[PDB]
Each structure stands twice: as structure tokens, then as C-alpha cells.
Amino acid sequence: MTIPSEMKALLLVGDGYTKTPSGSALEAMEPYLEQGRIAVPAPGPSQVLIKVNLASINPSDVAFIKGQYGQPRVKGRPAGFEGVGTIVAGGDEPYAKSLVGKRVAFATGLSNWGSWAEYAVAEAAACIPLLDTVRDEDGAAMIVNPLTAIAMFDIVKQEGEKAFVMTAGASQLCKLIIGLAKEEGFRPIVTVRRDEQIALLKDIGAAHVLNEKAPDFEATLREVMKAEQPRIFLDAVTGPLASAIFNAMPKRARWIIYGRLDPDATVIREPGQLIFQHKHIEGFWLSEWMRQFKERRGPAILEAQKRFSDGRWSTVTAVVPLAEAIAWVPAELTKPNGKVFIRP
Amino acid sequence: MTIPSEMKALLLVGDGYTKTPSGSALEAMEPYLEQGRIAVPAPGPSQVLIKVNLASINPSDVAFIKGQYGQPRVKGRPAGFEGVGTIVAGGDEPYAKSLVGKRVAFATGLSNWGSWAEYAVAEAAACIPLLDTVRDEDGAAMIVNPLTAIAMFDIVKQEGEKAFVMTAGASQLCKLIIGLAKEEGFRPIVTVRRDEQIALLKDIGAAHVLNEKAPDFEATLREVMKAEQPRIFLDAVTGPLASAIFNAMPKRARWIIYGRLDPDATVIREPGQLIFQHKHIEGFWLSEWMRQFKERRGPAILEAQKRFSDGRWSTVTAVVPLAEAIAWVPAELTKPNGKVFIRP
Ligand SMILES: [K+]
Ligand SMILES: [K+]
């Protein structure tokens, strides 16, 4: 089939993992990515080649290009973990061949042919054919945050306590979880760095919104922990903020780490709390959850698309042309609230 | 029945928890305990009054008298969590009355009438009538370390990996676990602070004994972790040593904290390991294990006594008279290896 043999893409400058980590802020793209023209890859037997319409930018992409994620970089490959597009070619396996022509939300995973390119490669199994009436803009961010929100909110529900805690309260993921929580009568306790994010987070359903920069934050924190008694803490930040939250939480608290936005030392302030107050510390990784809960993967994908299809969920501060991404994605990422997309 | 109305005891000077914690070393007894003559307590309906023959000294007692344990001090009460003795009186409940006259191993728990006294109070349920042919010296230390060893070694067995890690390798508890491990073909990896403790720990069955003070400790540590691939880490120390061990362990490692011998900051060096390597951090508390695994309590008590009765287990550096305990227990506790007992 007629597919271009060359494409523009945002190519990884770094290889493997970094020897000089520099936190989670994306100050510039040029140390990590270069705009280039490269050969269009060929999908393997279980893979599909997608003509990318829109690609998301998630905290996992920023960590990955910096060599600070749990997956190594392949120098010279396009970065980008997810997007939306149309499948223009597939490997010889029937799953891949049957998807050709379909518009899909996709996750590139370990393909090492990212979405920040005119064409990406994904496993057929990492694609979600979109319903004919679903929006393209809903498709580009349909996987990473929606499935993580469903999977992690399921932990909150199974624990049964109405209150739960989240750091990085203003992140797109936290906003999806806040929405789910409000529907089921759960009470999110979230932390922010800006007073201007309090009203919006309370509007979507947060019961408490605490500014971690406030002088009396720890004292306010203890009052809220006593009043609400949450057991689940979903943490994207780690460091001293998460150390303080965990320390203030009641007995049987579970500190569930799923991001490391703060590289500062993460201290277990009182290890005796794990002994005497039965506290636990664990991690959450969507790729692992999908591997271990294959039977929950299907219903979560069906629930996420149903929510986008029936209006319960609808995603966007900026759409950046791929030709402008190296120069202006960092400026757009500094804007509080909303997700940034790349348009090849 | 004729029981003295007065007794000698080592009374708590401190109340509740301390506001000035001072680590795990017992430099002196006088800040924490005073020898006194006090009224013999009366057992409550579910309790027994024990004439103490021998009382153990465990790290939990040192932490407790310092106000650094997970149970508050009651000023003026005798300290001491366990011992052996004869029941001379019981509360009116049949369990307590049926134990009168029996020689028992006992745990005082929350009775607030400790074993470092001529008479202690324990729940009837916290007593183990000793077999008529069992030694008194085996009875005084039959509960805390043997039941913790059984319960924690069960975690190692259920995980199924032959290698496992323990800090404070030379402690009585670690030595009991090492013995269990050797019987079942498990491979203990333990850390010590003295080269002189290597031979003895290897003699009882440790596969690896690492001196944490060695300049190349972390490099040796990584070589051993790669070679042995343990998943369970039983930690009595916490702090930087435990932080380093956890960091070097392979995927799916469980850091099980059951003591805090090092009060220095406990850091999760790479929180990403909980995300990407599925690592967990939890606590272990024998009192909680007995509450949650009531059905395992009976077989562990029967297995511990059977091991003492049939020679598999047999406990002792010093027996200190109660009249000498304030002055000389700290000097005896500094002696590496062996347990110290108090004889009222
Ligand atoms: K590198
Ligand atoms: K106090």
C-alpha cells in the first residue's frame, strides 16, 4: 500500500537512561529532542503503523525524553507514548491486519516508534478503535490518563473509605479521578502549589484543596486527616510533601506512588507507623496493572470510551504543530491547567 | 490465697511517649527505671497474677522504657513484656482460674504490670502453660522472639524465594530465623557491624554475612543481590542501611519493617522502584499478626513449645538479679551475642 517512505518526527537525542537527572520540569526540548526527517518504520507481525492525527504530552513523556522514566530511550527514535490516528498498515497477524483503516487511540509502549511523528508504531493490542461518532480530540488522550484514573479509582473504591488523598491535584489525571469520585460520593483531598487552582478543583468535586506552600500546611493537613480519615494516598510527587502527607494519615494508610515529580529525598518520617499503624507503601504502574488484570482491561477500555461517547468525559490548553513543538512545547507546558497536544 | 501484698519491681520513670527520643542504645537504666517496693496488683477477670521466675530483656523493652515504642508508658508501673513464672492468682473468668498453679511463659501486653517485678499481670490468653518437662530458661523467652520468628519466616516461605535478607543479623530473633531457614534450605543474607559475628552467623546457617561498616559494602551488596535475588527483607534497623539494601534488591522486593534500631532518616532512594520494579514497603507487628491470624496463633505456639520440648530450640549471656538490674543491665546489653535476663 501507498504510504510515505519519509516523515517528520521529534527524535530522541538521549540514549538509555540519564546519568545527570534534572527533575520533572521541562525547561527546553533541544537537549532531549531534535526535529528530523527519517524513514517511516515498518510494523512487525503484531503491530500497526498509524498515521498520527494528534499526540498527547503526558508527564511520562517528559520523564522519558529526559531519560528519567522506567523505560530506556532509543536514540534517534521519535518519542511520544500516545495519540490518535488512522492505521495505514499492519503486520501479517490477523489482529493487526483487521485494524487497517481504523481510526484508533493508541499507546506506543515499547515499540520505540513514538507518537511525536507523522507515523507511529503500536501493538495491535495497544489500540482502541474509536466508535465512528467519537471525537478525534477525545481519542488522543483516551488511554493513559483515563485508564489510570479508572484503575486507581478502583483501588479507592475497594478500600471503601470515602476520603482519599492525591498530590499534584491540578494534573489532568487527578481531575479525571476527582470527577469519578464526585459521581460515587467519594471525597478527594488534593494538594496544589497555586491558590488560583483551589476554586477549579473544588468545582469539579474535590472536598479539600490544600496549598502545600501555605505556612500552616502541616497543621491544616493534620486537621483534615483527623476529620476525613482517608486510607488511600495516590502520589505523583513523592519527596517531602508526600512524606508529610503519609506521616499525617491514619492507621492502615496506603501510600501508592505512581509518579516522581519531586526528585528531593522521599523520607519515611516514622517507620514505626508501618509497624504499629499497619501503613503500607507501594507503586502503581498502568502497564503492570494491564498485565496483571487482563480481565479488567476490557471493561476499563469499554468504560473509558463509553464515557467519551456518552458525554460523561470530554478532554486542552494548546495544539502545537509538530514544526513548532521543539521551540514552544516548554512554554505551553508551564501554563497551569489543560493538556498540550502535538499535531503532526 | 496467701500472696505477698508488697513486691520489688523496676518502675517506669517516664509516662506516655518521649518528647526527646534518643535512639536504641541503652546507655543507663536510671533515666527510665527506678527500683522500688510497690503493692502487688490484683488481676482483672480475664487476667492472671504471675510470680515471676525469670524475665527477658528484648529490644522492644528498651524502646518501651525510653517512650520510643508503639505502646505508652504508665509511670510507676513495672516494665518488662515477657517472662516465665507460676500463676498464683487469677480473675474470676474460668480461663484465668484454670491456669492457677501452672508454670507459664507469659506476655504482659497492655496489662501495665510488667515482668520486671516479683509479680506480673498477663491476660490468661497471653500465657503458655509449659510442658512439665520444659526448662524454665526456655520459658522466659518462649514468646516474643520464637513466635515472631515463626510468623516472619512463614512470610519468607510463602514468597518461595530461597534467599532473603535481614538487618541486625546477630540479634536473637535473626538467629532463630537463620536456624529455621537452614532446616528448610533457605539462604539468609544478613548484615552485622562486627567482623567477629561473621563466623557465628555462618555457623548457624547464614548464606551471606555482610559487615555494613566495610568500605565496599554497597558494591558487595549489589553482587550478593544479583547472585541470590531475594524478595523478602526483614528489617529491624531502618535508616540508611535499610535504604541501601532495599535499593539494591531485585524486582518485587518487600521491605518488611519490624524494628527501628537506627533513628537516622529512612529514605526511599528510588521511589521509581516501587512503580517499575513492583517493590513494597510494609510493617510487621507480632501483636497484630496474632490478632489477624488467630487460626495460626495456636499452631505457632504448639510449634514453638514442641521445638523447645524436643531439643530443636534451646535459649543467654547473663542472668541479672533484679536488685542489680538498674545498675548493670546496660553493661550486659553492650556484650555482643546472647540474651540478658532479670531474676526477681
Ligand atoms: K545514557
Ligand atoms: K511523656
XYZ file of C-alpha atoms and ligand atoms in Angstrom:
690
model
C 0.000 0.000 0.000
C 1.000 3.620 -0.713
C 2.465 5.102 2.445
C 5.232 7.809 2.522
C 8.722 6.459 2.910
C 9.921 9.573 4.841
C 8.367 11.513 7.721
C 8.982 14.367 10.126
C 9.352 13.436 13.811
C 10.711 14.633 17.213
C 13.705 12.361 17.680
C 15.322 11.365 20.948
C 18.775 12.906 21.402
C 19.444 10.833 24.523
C 20.033 7.102 24.747
C 19.060 4.744 27.592
C 18.721 6.477 30.964
C 20.312 9.698 32.091
C 23.446 9.917 34.246
C 22.526 13.536 35.158
C 18.788 13.596 36.222
C 17.258 17.097 36.309
C 13.812 16.823 37.913
C 10.411 16.907 36.221
C 10.270 20.478 34.769
C 10.770 20.700 31.009
C 12.872 23.809 30.663
C 13.709 23.155 26.956
C 13.166 20.481 24.279
C 16.529 20.911 22.446
C 18.637 18.884 24.971
C 16.246 15.921 24.513
C 14.647 16.077 21.102
C 15.512 17.179 17.612
C 13.149 17.697 14.729
C 14.201 15.477 11.866
C 13.112 13.700 8.710
C 13.517 9.927 8.980
C 12.345 6.769 7.245
C 8.829 5.625 8.043
C 9.127 2.383 10.087
C 7.594 -0.963 9.106
C 5.258 -2.639 11.656
C 6.209 -6.051 12.988
C 3.779 -9.018 12.709
C 1.648 -7.992 15.789
C 1.947 -4.227 15.140
C 0.245 -1.470 13.215
C 1.570 1.667 11.557
C -0.524 4.667 12.485
C -0.797 7.975 10.615
C -0.843 10.263 13.647
C -3.562 12.889 13.798
C -2.837 14.207 17.340
C -0.377 13.133 20.007
C -0.692 13.802 23.748
C 2.039 15.119 26.014
C 1.953 13.442 29.442
C 4.297 13.709 32.487
C 5.527 10.174 31.497
C 6.727 11.626 28.093
C 8.673 14.445 29.823
C 10.305 11.919 32.205
C 11.003 9.542 29.324
C 12.755 12.054 26.984
C 14.880 13.159 29.982
C 15.965 9.504 30.487
C 14.179 9.592 33.883
C 11.366 7.111 33.148
C 11.140 3.330 33.717
C 11.795 2.656 30.017
C 15.090 3.410 28.231
C 15.381 5.812 25.302
C 16.446 4.581 21.880
C 18.467 7.493 20.432
C 17.088 8.694 17.111
C 13.573 7.328 17.593
C 10.510 9.529 17.861
C 9.297 9.972 21.434
C 5.583 10.104 22.478
C 3.628 7.413 24.205
C 0.078 8.023 22.978
C -2.114 9.596 20.361
C -4.888 9.167 17.890
C -4.635 8.333 14.247
C -5.585 6.057 11.402
C -3.961 2.678 10.809
C -2.410 2.666 7.317
C -0.502 -0.656 7.549
C -0.332 -3.729 9.766
C 1.922 -6.726 10.322
C 0.748 -10.100 8.946
C -1.041 -11.235 12.135
C -4.868 -11.092 11.775
C -5.398 -8.694 14.721
C -3.019 -6.160 13.047
C -4.476 -6.724 9.524
C -8.093 -6.336 10.746
C -7.315 -2.919 12.217
C -6.054 -1.433 8.921
C -8.141 1.648 8.011
C -9.483 2.104 11.540
C -9.129 5.295 13.495
C -7.642 4.390 16.859
C -6.438 5.738 20.144
C -3.038 4.151 20.617
C -0.186 3.628 23.087
C 3.242 3.013 21.567
C 4.559 1.249 24.691
C 7.843 -0.462 23.844
C 7.550 -0.132 20.047
C 10.295 2.562 20.051
C 8.341 4.418 17.258
C 6.624 7.148 19.215
C 3.578 9.254 18.573
C 5.551 12.578 18.113
C 5.883 11.722 14.441
C 3.802 11.613 11.322
C 3.638 7.786 11.700
C 3.926 5.728 14.907
C 4.061 2.010 15.577
C 1.928 0.327 18.216
C 0.967 -3.222 19.109
C -2.466 -4.082 17.670
C -3.399 -4.883 21.304
C -2.462 -1.315 22.343
C -5.055 0.258 20.005
C -8.603 1.190 20.707
C -10.733 1.502 17.562
C -12.810 4.528 18.173
C -16.570 4.499 17.809
C -17.474 6.206 14.467
C -19.141 9.148 16.358
C -16.305 9.736 18.932
C -14.135 12.913 18.616
C -10.566 12.734 17.404
C -9.584 15.135 20.366
C -11.005 12.570 22.868
C -9.038 9.763 21.160
C -5.579 11.357 21.573
C -5.763 11.236 25.379
C -8.177 8.257 25.773
C -5.622 5.752 27.111
C -3.009 6.938 29.636
C -4.970 9.196 31.967
C -8.477 7.647 31.595
C -7.319 4.047 32.184
C -5.014 5.081 35.038
C -7.954 7.015 36.558
C -10.263 4.025 36.333
C -7.688 1.600 37.664
C -6.577 3.810 40.584
C -10.070 4.973 41.482
C -10.948 1.184 41.661
C -8.297 0.961 44.486
C -10.054 3.823 46.331
C -13.468 2.124 45.877
C -12.219 -1.297 47.011
C -10.731 0.282 50.151
C -14.228 1.703 50.870
C -13.228 4.897 52.710
C -14.976 7.945 51.168
C -11.974 10.257 51.638
C -8.720 9.735 49.745
C -5.642 11.864 49.085
C -3.839 12.948 45.919
C -0.759 15.077 45.331
C -0.476 17.182 42.072
C -4.183 17.916 42.394
C -4.367 20.078 39.288
C -2.984 17.400 36.911
C -5.310 16.047 34.155
C -5.229 12.587 35.797
C -6.261 13.961 39.232
C -9.063 15.933 37.587
C -10.429 12.724 35.965
C -10.285 10.900 39.350
C -11.937 13.875 41.112
C -14.821 13.588 38.548
C -15.229 9.824 39.193
C -15.105 10.444 42.952
C -17.834 13.123 42.805
C -20.133 10.700 40.904
C -19.769 7.993 43.589
C -19.774 10.321 46.630
C -16.054 9.974 47.371
C -14.168 12.928 48.907
C -10.876 13.863 47.298
C -8.230 15.636 49.354
C -5.772 17.201 46.967
C -2.686 19.367 47.226
C -1.742 22.259 44.873
C 1.107 24.875 44.631
C -1.183 27.758 43.473
C -4.146 29.362 45.303
C -5.700 30.011 41.806
C -6.224 26.218 41.360
C -8.362 25.853 44.518
C -11.688 27.072 43.008
C -11.410 24.924 39.868
C -10.560 21.727 41.764
C -13.378 22.317 44.242
C -15.712 22.985 41.270
C -15.067 19.542 39.768
C -15.549 17.814 43.153
C -12.516 17.995 45.441
C -13.613 18.003 49.108
C -10.337 19.604 50.221
C -7.718 21.523 48.254
C -4.598 22.347 50.237
C -1.865 24.735 49.150
C 1.375 22.940 50.106
C 3.167 26.377 50.102
C 0.970 27.697 52.965
C 2.949 28.283 56.222
C 0.407 26.241 58.254
C 0.093 23.425 55.630
C 1.143 20.577 58.026
C -1.227 21.809 60.787
C -4.142 22.123 58.242
C -3.102 18.711 56.896
C -3.441 17.035 60.349
C -6.863 18.687 60.871
C -8.081 17.361 57.514
C -6.619 13.859 58.128
C -8.382 13.709 61.513
C -11.691 14.937 60.019
C -11.688 12.741 56.873
C -9.638 9.614 57.862
C -8.535 8.670 54.279
C -6.688 5.422 53.716
C -5.618 5.736 50.086
C -2.979 8.205 49.048
C -2.307 8.402 45.283
C 1.015 10.135 44.961
C 2.514 11.614 41.754
C 5.072 13.829 43.566
C 6.928 11.913 46.340
C 9.558 13.908 48.262
C 8.908 15.899 51.466
C 5.286 16.756 50.564
C 4.342 13.106 50.214
C 6.433 12.218 53.324
C 4.363 14.746 55.369
C 1.041 13.525 53.967
C 1.832 9.854 54.669
C 3.001 10.728 58.190
C -0.305 12.549 58.959
C -2.561 9.838 57.559
C -4.471 7.480 59.885
C -3.828 3.781 60.502
C -3.863 1.344 57.545
C -2.918 4.128 55.108
C -1.565 3.021 51.723
C 0.913 5.351 50.003
C 0.545 4.479 46.325
C 3.330 6.066 44.313
C 2.684 6.424 40.561
C 4.979 9.383 39.700
C 8.093 11.204 40.991
C 7.543 14.864 40.168
C 9.755 15.894 43.120
C 13.263 14.329 42.969
C 14.051 15.572 46.544
C 14.629 12.755 49.130
C 11.482 10.738 49.970
C 11.636 10.002 53.691
C 9.517 7.563 55.727
C 9.357 10.039 58.630
C 8.190 7.497 61.230
C 8.842 3.894 60.125
C 7.114 2.841 63.397
C 3.838 3.788 61.636
C 4.251 0.827 59.335
C 4.693 -1.433 62.396
C 2.066 -0.041 64.796
C -0.368 1.709 62.406
C -0.219 -1.003 59.671
C 0.695 1.527 56.943
C 1.895 0.321 53.504
C 3.877 1.840 50.676
C 3.508 0.568 47.123
C 3.641 1.640 43.488
C 1.170 1.750 40.667
C 2.092 1.301 37.001
C -0.678 1.195 34.381
C 1.366 -1.185 32.134
C 1.695 -3.595 35.096
C -1.990 -3.266 36.064
C -2.987 -4.203 32.450
C -0.660 -7.244 32.601
C -1.945 -8.446 35.996
C -5.641 -7.605 35.481
C -6.195 -8.648 31.857
C -9.853 -9.361 32.751
C -10.252 -5.711 33.958
C -8.539 -4.208 30.867
C -11.557 -4.829 28.583
C -14.245 -3.348 30.890
C -11.985 -0.291 31.671
C -11.412 0.351 27.897
C -15.191 -0.067 27.314
C -16.000 2.246 30.278
C -13.457 4.926 29.174
C -14.763 5.001 25.545
C -18.432 4.837 26.772
C -17.728 7.938 28.991
C -16.278 9.805 25.993
C -19.097 8.551 23.691
C -21.953 9.447 26.087
C -20.605 12.839 27.239
C -19.533 11.931 30.818
C -15.884 12.566 29.761
C -14.617 15.251 27.311
C -10.926 16.446 27.161
C -6.814 21.054 26.095
C -4.837 24.324 26.535
C -2.855 24.078 23.260
C -2.466 22.195 19.965
C 1.144 22.651 18.888
C 2.179 21.924 15.282
C 4.971 19.365 15.173
C 7.125 22.033 13.380
C 6.669 24.282 16.449
C 6.958 21.588 19.164
C 10.746 21.816 19.874
C 10.531 25.542 20.280
C 7.222 26.028 22.094
C 6.040 22.918 23.927
C 8.017 24.002 27.159
C 6.314 27.436 27.111
C 2.919 25.756 26.784
C 3.635 23.150 29.490
C 4.283 25.963 32.076
C 0.670 27.172 31.635
C -1.259 25.840 34.682
C -4.279 23.568 33.869
C -5.073 21.923 30.494
C -3.202 19.362 28.366
C -0.817 20.175 25.460
C -1.083 18.193 22.172
C 1.260 17.864 19.188
C -0.280 17.922 15.669
C 1.983 16.327 13.015
C -4.977 -17.127 98.797
C -1.724 -16.110 100.528
C 0.227 -13.866 98.189
C 2.568 -11.004 99.334
C 0.958 -7.604 99.397
C 4.262 -5.809 98.543
C 6.929 -6.535 95.929
C 10.145 -5.211 94.442
C 9.986 -4.050 90.807
C 11.724 -1.870 88.146
C 9.290 1.012 87.814
C 8.843 3.283 84.826
C 10.057 6.831 85.489
C 8.636 8.085 82.188
C 4.998 8.490 81.234
C 3.421 8.069 77.778
C 5.859 8.624 74.909
C 9.052 10.620 74.928
C 9.381 14.176 73.601
C 13.190 13.707 73.381
C 13.884 10.329 71.588
C 17.469 9.068 71.993
C 17.923 6.080 69.673
C 18.016 2.389 70.573
C 21.190 2.124 72.751
C 20.549 1.749 76.477
C 23.263 3.891 77.976
C 21.746 3.803 81.521
C 18.639 2.498 83.324
C 18.297 5.362 85.880
C 16.637 7.876 83.462
C 13.924 5.276 82.698
C 13.524 2.939 85.631
C 13.755 3.032 89.383
C 13.902 0.099 91.735
C 11.022 0.325 94.161
C 8.743 -1.570 96.511
C 5.094 -1.335 95.464
C 1.786 -3.061 96.127
C 1.231 -6.356 94.355
C -1.514 -5.781 91.725
C -4.803 -7.694 91.551
C -5.631 -9.468 88.243
C -8.764 -8.435 86.389
C -11.437 -11.032 85.447
C -9.552 -12.325 82.308
C -6.068 -11.965 83.863
C -3.614 -13.904 85.967
C -1.068 -12.819 88.552
C 2.273 -14.461 87.923
C 5.115 -14.966 90.408
C 7.988 -14.172 88.052
C 10.868 -16.623 87.940
C 12.823 -15.019 85.040
C 12.079 -12.073 82.783
C 13.561 -11.471 79.321
C 15.022 -8.215 78.059
C 14.135 -7.601 74.398
C 14.786 -4.601 72.070
C 11.008 -3.844 72.450
C 11.561 -3.386 76.274
C 14.454 -0.929 75.702
C 12.330 1.061 73.203
C 9.332 0.930 75.533
C 11.079 2.234 78.710
C 12.558 5.059 76.576
C 8.998 6.015 75.478
C 10.003 5.076 71.895
C 7.747 2.028 71.417
C 4.222 1.720 69.950
C 2.707 1.457 73.443
C 2.697 4.285 76.016
C 4.373 4.027 79.416
C 2.332 4.194 82.604
C 4.629 5.990 85.086
C 5.238 3.949 88.223
C 4.400 0.569 86.698
C 6.929 -2.214 86.303
C 8.254 -2.535 82.756
C 9.011 -5.891 81.005
C 6.981 -7.545 78.324
C 7.701 -11.241 78.874
C 8.911 -13.885 81.255
C 8.271 -17.177 82.909
C 6.657 -17.828 86.226
C 3.946 -19.545 88.195
C 0.361 -18.303 88.318
C -0.566 -17.610 91.960
C -3.950 -15.899 91.374
C -6.480 -15.398 88.593
C -9.517 -13.256 87.848
C -12.958 -14.913 88.120
C -13.184 -15.975 84.449
C -12.703 -19.765 84.007
C -9.688 -19.455 81.657
C -7.846 -17.386 84.341
C -8.985 -19.652 87.243
C -7.951 -22.858 85.403
C -4.406 -21.560 84.967
C -3.803 -21.015 88.708
C -0.778 -23.072 89.843
C 0.565 -23.528 86.314
C 4.040 -22.544 85.276
C 3.716 -20.370 82.190
C 5.593 -18.360 79.642
C 3.780 -15.041 79.549
C 3.486 -11.729 77.692
C 2.189 -8.790 79.722
C 0.999 -6.889 76.628
C -1.203 -3.997 77.735
C -1.659 -5.145 81.352
C 0.656 -2.321 82.559
C 2.076 -4.759 85.225
C 5.332 -5.812 83.636
C 7.574 -8.795 84.085
C 10.487 -6.791 85.715
C 8.836 -7.372 89.071
C 8.294 -10.124 91.563
C 4.677 -10.419 90.280
C 3.332 -9.515 86.819
C -0.150 -9.446 85.348
C -0.988 -11.002 81.998
C -4.138 -11.935 80.121
C -4.904 -15.653 80.554
C -4.805 -15.762 76.721
C -1.222 -14.402 76.764
C 0.091 -17.370 78.796
C 1.535 -20.597 77.590
C 1.401 -23.377 80.193
C 4.696 -25.074 79.874
C 5.002 -28.812 79.411
C 6.047 -30.366 82.786
C 9.489 -31.372 81.321
C 10.298 -27.986 79.619
C 13.077 -25.767 81.119
C 12.253 -22.594 82.989
C 15.108 -20.812 80.945
C 13.307 -21.760 77.673
C 10.002 -20.412 79.060
C 11.259 -16.864 79.775
C 11.972 -16.165 76.097
C 9.429 -18.592 74.516
C 7.003 -15.947 73.209
C 8.406 -12.754 71.645
C 11.310 -13.984 69.540
C 10.111 -17.566 68.785
C 6.615 -16.515 67.636
C 7.974 -13.553 65.659
C 10.498 -15.941 64.040
C 7.800 -18.411 63.066
C 5.448 -15.743 61.788
C 8.094 -13.857 59.768
C 9.797 -16.971 58.441
C 6.252 -18.003 57.204
C 6.348 -14.786 55.037
C 9.711 -15.896 53.576
C 8.340 -19.415 52.884
C 5.123 -18.140 51.279
C 7.163 -15.872 48.984
C 9.079 -19.017 47.886
C 12.462 -17.431 47.095
C 15.284 -19.308 48.895
C 17.300 -16.149 49.626
C 16.034 -13.461 51.995
C 17.622 -10.501 53.772
C 17.802 -9.423 57.413
C 19.406 -6.445 59.122
C 20.724 -6.804 62.764
C 21.912 -10.286 61.839
C 23.369 -11.060 65.250
C 20.111 -10.426 67.178
C 18.464 -13.404 68.983
C 15.446 -13.147 66.638
C 17.625 -13.269 63.478
C 19.496 -16.256 64.899
C 16.185 -18.147 65.401
C 15.120 -17.328 61.796
C 18.565 -18.348 60.464
C 18.056 -21.760 62.215
C 14.584 -22.228 60.641
C 15.973 -21.197 57.245
C 18.842 -23.724 57.425
C 16.336 -26.540 58.176
C 14.241 -25.720 55.076
C 17.150 -24.882 52.731
C 16.563 -21.119 52.739
C 19.552 -18.758 52.371
C 19.756 -15.881 54.817
C 21.625 -12.731 53.842
C 22.366 -10.807 56.994
C 24.186 -7.625 57.910
C 26.389 -7.085 61.016
C 28.565 -4.222 62.461
C 31.368 -6.545 63.742
C 33.640 -8.903 61.746
C 33.695 -11.186 64.885
C 29.974 -12.022 64.315
C 30.528 -13.384 60.778
C 31.754 -16.893 61.784
C 28.969 -17.478 64.324
C 26.176 -16.400 61.963
C 27.586 -18.525 59.148
C 27.857 -21.442 61.626
C 24.123 -21.367 62.389
C 23.220 -21.150 58.672
C 23.551 -17.663 57.189
C 24.460 -17.875 53.477
C 25.893 -14.342 53.492
C 27.050 -12.145 56.363
C 27.930 -8.606 55.338
C 29.717 -6.066 57.506
C 27.824 -2.803 56.873
C 30.963 -0.862 58.058
C 33.095 -2.253 55.179
C 34.142 0.459 52.646
C 32.871 -1.656 49.701
C 29.613 -2.735 51.470
C 27.243 -1.326 48.759
C 29.288 -2.913 45.919
C 29.370 -6.317 47.786
C 25.656 -5.819 48.492
C 24.802 -5.443 44.754
C 26.892 -8.548 43.913
C 25.023 -10.588 46.531
C 21.594 -9.232 45.445
C 22.363 -10.165 41.823
C 23.599 -13.653 42.820
C 20.796 -14.510 45.296
C 17.746 -12.472 44.068
C 15.946 -12.290 47.484
C 12.469 -10.818 47.657
C 11.883 -10.604 51.403
C 13.770 -8.138 53.524
C 13.086 -8.349 57.286
C 14.335 -5.098 58.703
C 14.923 -4.302 62.409
C 17.179 -1.267 61.749
C 15.707 1.067 59.068
C 17.765 4.184 58.268
C 20.452 4.414 55.552
C 21.489 0.738 55.834
C 17.975 -0.473 55.117
C 17.546 2.227 52.405
C 20.663 0.841 50.610
C 19.543 -2.781 50.950
C 16.041 -2.066 49.599
C 17.513 -0.061 46.709
C 19.807 -2.985 45.698
C 17.124 -5.659 45.916
C 15.539 -7.111 42.754
C 12.010 -6.560 41.446
C 9.017 -7.424 43.678
C 11.097 -6.910 46.839
C 9.152 -6.448 50.082
C 10.776 -4.306 52.785
C 9.186 -5.569 55.994
C 9.992 -3.240 58.865
C 9.611 -4.718 62.371
C 12.049 -2.516 64.365
C 13.751 0.914 64.227
C 17.189 0.403 65.741
C 18.576 3.297 63.651
C 16.640 6.576 64.178
C 18.522 8.245 61.243
C 16.275 9.241 58.257
C 14.841 6.263 56.321
C 14.903 7.235 52.651
C 13.201 5.508 49.700
C 16.241 6.172 47.487
C 14.455 5.494 44.180
C 10.650 5.659 44.530
C 10.515 4.681 40.812
C 11.418 1.146 42.006
C 8.008 0.839 43.588
C 6.417 1.847 40.252
C 8.569 -0.063 37.738
C 10.024 -2.879 39.894
C 6.792 -3.530 41.891
C 8.567 -3.128 45.263
C 6.532 -2.833 48.502
C 7.186 -1.477 51.962
C 5.234 -2.736 54.959
C 5.486 -3.389 58.686
C 5.261 -6.437 60.862
C 3.943 -6.420 64.433
C 3.586 -9.724 66.304
C 0.572 -8.402 68.319
C -1.172 -7.534 65.018
C -0.242 -10.868 63.390
C -1.814 -12.731 66.390
C -4.988 -10.615 66.036
C -5.291 -11.144 62.261
C -4.179 -14.802 62.157
C -5.904 -16.244 65.236
C -6.004 -19.629 63.442
C -2.159 -19.522 63.060
C -1.547 -18.489 66.707
C -2.306 -21.987 68.087
C -0.082 -23.973 65.669
C 2.805 -21.419 66.120
C 2.561 -21.702 69.973
C 2.445 -25.531 69.623
C 5.411 -25.491 67.176
C 7.499 -23.122 69.389
C 6.941 -25.230 72.572
C 7.446 -28.516 70.587
C 10.851 -27.135 69.352
C 11.867 -26.315 72.940
C 10.467 -29.660 74.233
C 12.161 -31.824 71.558
C 15.552 -30.049 71.540
C 15.316 -28.229 68.161
C 15.307 -24.894 70.090
C 17.253 -24.077 73.309
C 17.976 -20.458 74.516
C 21.773 -16.444 77.475
C 24.824 -14.231 78.238
C 23.670 -13.082 81.712
C 21.097 -13.581 84.484
C 20.914 -10.300 86.381
C 19.326 -10.175 89.855
C 16.513 -7.640 89.959
C 18.485 -5.809 92.740
C 21.373 -5.407 90.252
C 19.304 -4.654 87.112
C 19.262 -0.797 87.298
C 22.989 -0.694 87.733
C 24.210 -3.456 85.419
C 21.711 -4.359 82.705
C 23.236 -1.626 80.311
C 26.746 -3.089 80.792
C 25.417 -6.559 79.988
C 23.386 -5.388 76.967
C 26.597 -3.993 75.305
C 28.072 -7.532 75.234
C 27.641 -8.775 71.622
C 25.592 -12.029 71.222
C 23.363 -13.681 73.873
C 20.218 -12.508 75.696
C 20.126 -10.821 79.151
C 17.531 -11.959 81.754
C 16.318 -10.397 85.009
C 15.793 -12.707 88.034
C 13.431 -11.221 90.664
K 22.656 7.150 28.666
K 5.592 11.950 78.086
